[PDB]
Amino acid sequence: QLADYLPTACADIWSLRGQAVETNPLYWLRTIDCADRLMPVQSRAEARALTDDNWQNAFRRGILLADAKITPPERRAIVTRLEALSAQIPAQVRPVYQIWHDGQALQLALSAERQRYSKLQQMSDSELDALRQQQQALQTQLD
Amino acid sequence: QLADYLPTACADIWSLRGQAVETNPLYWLRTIDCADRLMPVQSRAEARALTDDNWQNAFRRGILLADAKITPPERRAIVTRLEALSAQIPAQVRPVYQIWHDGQALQLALSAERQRYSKLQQMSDSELDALRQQQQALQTQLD
């Protein structure tokens, strides 16, 4: 039987500290639910009130900044830092972190696929332009 | 305070039924953790005994089949059915479903992006071919 931190207000959830809250999966579940309700300007403001010296603050910061319109390099650094400290996460919290990490990894894969698409778009047009110029040369020669 | 079903054995988590278990987010969190441990053949063997009649069985079935190597149309049908039933999910469970649904929506977007990429690959080769044929026909006539 665990404590229920879900009814905790989203305005006060980012102020709770201690081992009692940081080992409860229902607390971390509430932080993700509360961060999903915030706008990018509020998420970054709450993230500025946190550091990343330990796994607790790094998890809070990553949860807040995930939807704060960050760049793919910024999301990759957040995931990499948490993956290095994920061994310190208690076992009861890890299922929450694993689901959150899988979503962030899918966002990184999505951004990587967007970049591959634009690279193909530019590669295709560059190859099409070369054949076009060769066609214009032959057409002018025939004319 | 909420009951803790995280230490519940993964071999017996699929047989748990009732309103006391299905309204506890820790039960559904353990369900996702246990399904992540199963191979596609084991996930399908558990999910084949269930259907999508209600939100409880549809969620259990979708959690098991998420990593069972299903097709994008099959995952879309599971997500769409659960979205229609998401109104009946209790408030304390919805944070578990929302993060699970967001991960499934990212998999659908990743599948659509990959299909769009191969679509560009075929359209690019088709246009390149058409220019190559035009160039060749121009060369023979130039000769």
Numbering used by the authors:
A (entry chain A), B (entry chain B): 58 to 200
From the paper:
Here, we report that the outer membrane lipoprotein QseG functions as an accessory protein that directly binds to and activates the histidine kinase QseE via its C-terminal domain. QseEF, a TCS responsive to multiple ligands including phosphate, sulfate, adrenaline, and AI-3, is essential for the virulence of pathogenic Enterobacteriaceae. Notably, genomic analyses reveal that a third gene qseG is co-transcribed with qseE and qseF, encoding an outer membrane lipoprotein anchored to the inner leaflet via N-terminal lipid modification. Collectively, our findings establish QseG as an endogenous activator of the QseEF signaling pathway via a conserved regulatory mechanism.
To refine atomic modeling, we additionally determined the crystal structures of QseG37-221 at 2.1 Å and the QseE sensor domain at 2.4 Å resolution. The lipoprotein QseG is anchored in the outer membrane, facing the periplasm under physiological conditions, with residues 1-36 comprising its signal sequence. The N-terminal region of each monomer QseG forms a globular fold with α-helices, whereas the C-terminus adopts a two-helix bundle, with each monomer contributing a long parallel helix. Following cleavage of the secretion signal peptide, the first N-terminal cysteine (herein, Cys37 within the long N-terminal loopC37-E57 of QseG in S. Typhimurium SL1344) undergoes lipidation, thereby anchoring QseG to the inner leaflet of the bacterial outer membrane. QseG37-end and QseG37-221 retained QseE-binding capability, whereas further C-terminal truncations (QseG37-214, QseG37-193, and QseG37-181) abolished this interaction. Consistent with the pull-down results, only QseG truncations that retained QseE-binding capacity induced autophosphorylation. These findings indicate that the QseG C-terminus is essential for QseE activation, highlighting QseG’s critical role in the QseEF TCS regulatory pathway. To assess the functional significance of the QseG-QseE interface, we introduced site-directed mutations in key QseG residues (L209D, E213A, R214A, R219A, and K220A) predicted to be essential for complex formation. Notably, the L209D and R219A mutations completely disrupted QseG-QseE complex formation (lanes 2, 9, 10, 13) and significantly reduced QseE autophosphorylation (lanes 2–4, lanes 1–3, 6). These findings highlight the crucial role of Leu209 and Arg219 in stabilizing the QseG-QseE interaction and activating QseE’s autokinase function.
